[PDB]
């Protein structure tokens, strides 16, 4: 029954994020759509598992156990936020509030993950098809049909193929791949990471140069946050930053200041991120990452 206490905690978060003092923007990730849509897909799951055996098998499904826990954990966390923050949660620019945006981002990724792992409410994690063949092979060789793996084990296996240089690189990596922030990597999270920092063959070097050392890279930011941040640099066209698309997981969203002072965001589709950044740089659109002068040379990744 732990799914019932999870809904109560979620309902509270929603009820609590409905407080119109927040002036929340209907813009993905929008918590007032995400949490009820999550309860709904959870409804859809319980209804597809319609008798006691099916409910028993579900209760033993490892991914689902981790999911419901995470979701309790995270729902508890958002409640804790509002209790500790109180007044600060009405301040657009408080850290308590940024924390809530982060959590909204986490719920959005969790929502999309459950719709990929339980499409229509039926479990198909063991048949999730990884998008890239090299990454696919790798998940296969080490984890077969698992839907979800603990970080440490993921890390140990990854390291046998693509070596991690140090502890803090491992931590920066975890933080990049563990989008749901539950200290596990699902096949879905892995699909996303391997799409973002393709090709598989040079994957950690791609991440190193596109994320770990790149000033333009923004972790856990929204569309609205990108726009507000580049607003500071609107007198310096060519200012840009990039991040994970929230509504098109596995792809990047590039935000830039145009010559006329507009903030546009664009999503590469065929072109991998590095070519998009080389192409943009050379035509004057992507010159100043996060408003800064030094723009990393990415030509070596071709």
């Amino acid at each position: 029954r732990t799914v019932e206490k999870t809904w109560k905690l979620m309902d509270k978060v929603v009820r609590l994020c409905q407080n119109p003092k927040l002036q929340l923007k209907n813009s993905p990730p929008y918590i007032l759509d995400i949490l009820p849509d999550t309860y709904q897909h959870l409804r859809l799951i319980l209804s597809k598992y319609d008798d006691n055996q099916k409910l028993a098998q579900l209760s033993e499904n490892e991914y689902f156990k981790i999911y419901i826990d995470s979701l309790m954990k995270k729902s508890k966390r958002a409640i804790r936020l509002f209790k500790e923050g109180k007044e600060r949660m009405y301040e657009e620019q408080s850290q308590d509030r940024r924390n809530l945006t982060k959590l909204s981002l986490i719920f959005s990724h969790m929502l999309a993950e459950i719709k990929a792992i339980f499409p229509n409410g039926q479990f198909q994690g063991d048949n999730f098809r990884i998008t890239k063949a090299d990454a696919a092979e790798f998940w296969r060789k080490f984890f077969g049909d698992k839907t979800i793996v603990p970080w440490k084990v993921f890390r140990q296996c990854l390291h046998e193929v693509h070596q991690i240089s140090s502890g803090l690189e491992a931590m920066a990596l975890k933080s990049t791949i563990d989008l749901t922030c539950n200290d596990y990597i699902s096949v879905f999270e892995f699909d996303i990471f391997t799409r973002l920092f393709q090709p598989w063959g040079s994957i950690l070097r791609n991440w190193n140069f596109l994320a770990v050392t790149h000033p333009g890279y923004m972790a856990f930011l929204t569309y609205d946050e990108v726009k507000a941040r580049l607003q500071k640099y609107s007198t310096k066209p060519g200012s840009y930053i990039f991040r994970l698309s929230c509504t098109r997981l596995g792809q990047w969203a590039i935000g830039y200041v145009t010559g006329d002072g507009n903030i546009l965001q664009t999503i590469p589709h065929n072109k991998p991120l590095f070519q998009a950044l080389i192409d943009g740089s050379r035509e004057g659109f992507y010159l100043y990452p996060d408003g800064r002068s030094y723009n990393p040379d990415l030509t070596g990744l071709a």
Binding site: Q265, I267, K271, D279
Partner: peptide
């Protein structure tokens, strides 16, 4: 244009 726009380089 919408929320996300076209590649500026073409």
């Amino acid at each position: 244009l919408q929320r996300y726009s076209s590649d500026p380089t073409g």
